[PDB]
Each structure stands twice: as C-alpha cells, then as structure tokens.
Design a protein around this ligand. Structure first.
Ligand code: HEM
Length: 156
C-alpha cells in the first residue's frame, strides 16, 4: 500500500530494460499464464483449446494481447507519479474486461503472480530481492484497483 520514491525509481529503471525486449517478454508471460492456469484460456476464441507453448506462441491473437498487456504496464509505469491517471487507466481496463470480455477478476491476480515469476527469471540480473518487492507493491496496487472497478460495475 505505501510505495516509496526509491521503489518507484527501482521500477522505472528495471522496466526500461524489460521494455527493450518487450515482445518476447509479453508472450513468455502470457504463455506461462495460459499453460500453468489453463482455464484462463477460455476467453480467447482462437486458442482456448491449445495446451502447448510452441503452439501458443504462434497465435496471432495471443501475441497481440501480449503486446497490449505490455503497453498497458508501460503506461502504468510512465504514469507512476500521477495517481489520478493510474486510476483512470485501471478504470478503463477493469470496465472493458468486466463488461466487454467478461474476465473473472481472479485472473488479473494470477497474472500479477506470473509477471514477477517471469521478470525475475528472464531478467534476474536486474530484479533483485529489493526490486521484486517494489514490483509486488505495484502489482498489488494494479490488482486492487481493478477489483475496485469490478465492484463499481456490479461483479460480486
Ligand atoms: C494488466 C493486464 C491487462 C491489460 C493491460 C490488458 C489489456 C487489454 C487490451 C488493451 C485489450 C484490447 C482493448 C480492449 O478490448 O479493452 C484487451 C483485450 C482482452 N483481454 Fe486483456 N489485458 C490485461 C489482462 C487480461 C487478462 C488477465 C485476461 C485474462 C484472460 C485478459 C483477457 C482479454 C481478452 C479476452 C480480451 C479480448 C481480446 C480478443 O478479442 O481476443 N486480459 N486486453
């Protein structure tokens, strides 16, 4: 809940390295999500029934979404010091996924999980225990605001 100025800097600085290899990382994340937590695949018409990473990484639909996810995060990171703006971003997100896509909010949580897991595996020389703790705080914030919108919207 309390995010510090140093942590904020930890995040901006690590993210700059992650964004440099943005695309592969996006999909590495989504492939772990969809493989490890398969029911999460249910919302995606073109690969809901695909189990294999090599199959999944070739899905045009997977990849576009993986791209959208990362741009999302990037926006959230560019915007860390402006809290009204993170609020609207999470609002927009949460609405769409609630109303248009009908995604169970649990998957946002599980995704936050996977992002750490993959960040601090693909980019371990940067994601130190300390940096990981900051990303934790951030992603709990993301997930918390998403849930808040989901309730505003009528999901209980
Ligand atoms: C930080 C997390 C995420 C971000 C930034 C994100 C962003 C987006 C964006 C920008 C779109 C397209 C624009 C829109 O329709 O609103 C989209 C579509 C979608 N998202 Fe996400 N999303 C995220 C997480 C999730 C998660 C966890 C799921 C879980 C299954 C999911 C499922 C979908 C689906 C089903 C669509 C429709 C895409 C399609 O037509 O194939 N998203 N997302």
């Amino acid at each position: 809940s309390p995010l510090t100025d140093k942590e904020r800097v930890m995040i901006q600085d690590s993210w700059a390295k992650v964004y440099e290899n943005s695309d592969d990382t996006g999909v590495a994340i989504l492939v772990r999500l969809f493989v490890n937590f398969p029911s999460s695949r249910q919302y995606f018409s073109q690969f809901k029934h695909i189990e294999e990473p090599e199959e999944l990484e070739r899905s045009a639909q997977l990849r576009k979404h993986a791209n959208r996810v990362m741009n999302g995060l990037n926006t959230l990171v560019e915007s860390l010091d402006n809290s009204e703006k993170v609020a609207s971003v999470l609002k927009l997100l949460g609405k769409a996924h609630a109303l248009r896509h009908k995604v169970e909010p649990v998957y946002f949580k599980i995704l936050s999980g996977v992002i750490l897991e993959v960040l601090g595996e693909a980019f371990s020389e940067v994601v130190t225990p300390e940096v990981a703790a900051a990303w934790t705080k951030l992603l709990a914030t993301i997930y918390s605001g998403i849930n808040a919108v989901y309730e505003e919207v009528g999901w209980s």
